[PDB]
Every structure is written in structure tokens, then in C-alpha cells.
Symmetry: D2
Subunit: 123 residues, 4 copies
């Protein structure tokens, strides 16, 4: 009964939000990612995401990955992590991400990758 499900509306520790739709039988899902300029805030861009959740042993707490294809930049971010629960109740996504910037010369590749985390909860 305690299936952690990616589908729905999520927010995070930096105040970014994401929506993910139905995950099919192969574990594929699409979504949207907002973001989060200045002021507030400032004002919001919306970016597409595509990923897969791992279906091996139809786990209640599966691992997943997804790519955010940023609309306001040449950058790409990948997130990977796991859907947990958590003492009710509360579903939580613990992710790690890599943010790739575009560089012009391959000589600059070494500096093009940031890493960090995101914890997501239901909105």
C-alpha cells in the first residue's frame, strides 16, 4: 500500500517546483520544472523534463533519473535519486544533480559541471 509515486506536484528546499505526469509501464515520465529568477523570486521560467524510474522488483521506493532541458539557457541538468516514505504519510524525493554548462572550447570542459542536492516534498 506504501508505493512512493513520482506523479504529481513537488516543491524543493530552494523553492523550485516541478510537475510530473503519469509514469507508464516502462517507467517513463515527462514533466515541467519551475524556477525561480530573482526578487521573490523575480519571475518564473518553465522547462521540460524527461526521465525514467527503475522498475526492477517493482519496488515501493524506486530510484529514478531525469533530465531538465533548460529553456532560458544552453545548460542541462540531470537529477537522480530515490522516492522514500517516511513515517505516515510523507513521501520525499532525495536527489542529487549535475548541472552542465556549455563551454566554447573543450579546454574549458573541466569547469563545466556543478553538483548538488535537492530534497522534494509534495506541494
Amino acid at each position: 500500500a506504501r508505493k512512493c509515486s513520482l506523479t504529481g506536484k513537488w516543491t524543493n528546499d530552494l523553492g523550485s517546483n516541478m510537475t510530473i505526469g503519469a509514469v507508464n509501464s516502462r517507467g517513463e515520465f515527462t514533466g515541467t520544472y519551475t524556477t525561480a529568477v530573482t526578487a521573490t523570486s523575480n519571475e518564473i521560467k518553465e522547462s521540460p523534463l524527461h526521465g525514467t524510474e527503475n522498475t526492477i522488483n517493482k519496488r515501493t521506493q524506486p530510484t529514478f533519473g531525469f533530465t531538465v532541458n533548460w529553456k532560458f539557457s544552453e545548460s542541462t541538468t540531470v537529477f537522480t535519486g530515490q522516492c522514500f516514505i517516511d513515517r505516515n504519510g510523507k513521501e520525499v524525493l532525495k536527489t542529487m544533480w549535475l548541472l552542465r554548462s556549455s563551454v566554447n572550447d573543450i579546454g574549458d570542459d573541466w569547469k563545466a559541471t556543478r553538483v548538488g542536492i535537492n530534497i522534494f516534498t509534495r506541494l
Copy 2:
């Protein structure tokens, strides 16, 4: 300087291979990821991948990300990186990945993410 195109067959610094199909107008692509060794032999599994290439400014050396949904484990890997024309003229994908393992308790989350790199050239 012409394009660096993700479509085709690639190999990497650890001897794994990947094939990527056409990238559509939204930057989407599917493919396959063939890995090893674990032997002796018992060699080659084949896992699906799905990703997107960034299209902002229709760059000749775009960034991209993809998720590999492992068939032989509960794990997921995400790659992100950039398609370069190396100094020598050859196309090269410089990537970094995050390999997420499935843990049973959210207390074991801290240890679930490996990181590394992969450099891909055409087969």
C-alpha cells in the same frame, strides 16, 4: 566547424558502448546502453536510455543529459555533458554521471550516490 551530433554509435573509456537514435525537434532521443564485464564472462546486458539535448541557440556543440534505467539492477544512472569537436577534429562526448543505488532505509541515503566520468568516441 560543423555539427556534433549525438545520433550514432559510441564507445567509452571503460569499454561500454551506446547507441543513440534520432534527436527530434524538441531535443529528445532514445537509445541503448551496453555494459560489462563481471567475469570470466557472463558478459553483456543492454539497458534503455532516454534523454534530451539542449537546443537553445542551436549550438554546434550542445549540452545534453540522459538517464539509464538499468535492466540488471535497481539502480539508475544519469549522464550529462557536452558534444565537442575535439582539437583533432573528432567528435567527442565529455560526460559526468551520477549512479544512484537503491537503499532500503532513508537513513542510508547519504551513501547511495556515486559520481564519475565518461568520455565517448564514435565506434
Copy 3:
């Protein structure tokens, strides 16, 4: 805005604790890292750490790195991050770490590095 000083006793989001001593004029410091749980109990090991704080522009919120030389394993961890005065006034260390495991064959190197984060507040 006053200093953010590494010297003192810290705790973190996973319940591990660390003590750091004086930082000398070159930015050097030693300390201790107390971790757990592995139980039941069999609880607390104590491992040495050694690091440096960056002193360029004698910043109030300097960056730093340190290496923890684990006593109970062959592994090494490195932390790096920054000492902030949080919005609430409290000192906080935001860090990222790389946990390197010992492997026997250089063919197993690709899998030897975990990554994550730790947020430290004063005990």
C-alpha cells in the same frame, strides 16, 4: 556582519560531530570527526581531520577544505564548503564531500567515489 570561524564544535544533519581547533595564520587547522551508528550500538569512532581555510581577502565567510582520514576503514573523505552567517544570524557550514573507497584493482576505480553534502551548526 562579524566573522564565521571554523574553530569550535560542530554537529550535522546526520548526527555526526566534529571539533576543529585554532586556525593558524596560513589557514591551517586540525580537529576530530566523530561519526556513527552501526547498531544496535557499537557506536562512536573518532578520526583525525586536517584542512585549510582560504585567507584571500580575509573574508568573513571563507571557503575551506579538509580531509578525514578514517580510523575504522581504508577510506578517505574530503569536505569542502563555506562558512556562512545564515539569514537568521547563526553560523553554518555548507559542505560537500567526496568519500573514496579503497578498491583492489584499478579496473574498479570508476565505482570508488561517493558524493554528498553536510550542513553543520554549532553544538
Copy 4:
């Protein structure tokens, strides 16, 4: 007889060089790190490093960590990895690093960490 030893002069895949001195009985060592501006090259800065190598089971291929306290910036880099050998002969250090930039507001923390690799060989 095949002890991989950190002490000496090393170069890397980006053309940076490092010298490390004697490692004591607790595994501590100091060194220097050059770097590598422009042109060539361009011209070289030299930065101090401090780290430890793990002594548990006096391994022939120990893991280590070290911090580079950059002299020309507010940044800090930590490297961790392992000293291998390799079919002679050839000692090789396979490292992963995190490069922390200084940011002014904790709101900007999420973007302050780059990750990458370095392979080092004897000069």
C-alpha cells in the same frame, strides 16, 4: 615491493603539476600545486596543499585526500582518490575533486561547487 608512494613530482591530464614531500607516520603530507593560467599556459601560480593518506592495513595502494588552498582566488579545492600500479612500473593517481567557489549570499550556495577528475603520473 610495490608500494605506491605520494611523495614526489606529479603532472596531470590538464597539464597542472604538483609536488608532495615526505608523508610522515600519521600519513600527513604537504605540497605545492601549479597551475596554469592562459596562453601556454600563460603564467604559473603556485599554491599550498595539505592532506593525509590513509594508513589502515598499510596498503600498497592507499586512498588519500588533500586540500588546495588557492593563492590567486577565494576558492578551495579538495582532491580524493587512490595511488595505483599498474603494469611495471607506472604509478598513477586517480582522483576526484570538488572545487568550491566563494559566494556572497548563502542563497547562492547551491551553485558553488564544481566536480571533476584528475589523473596524475610521475613527471
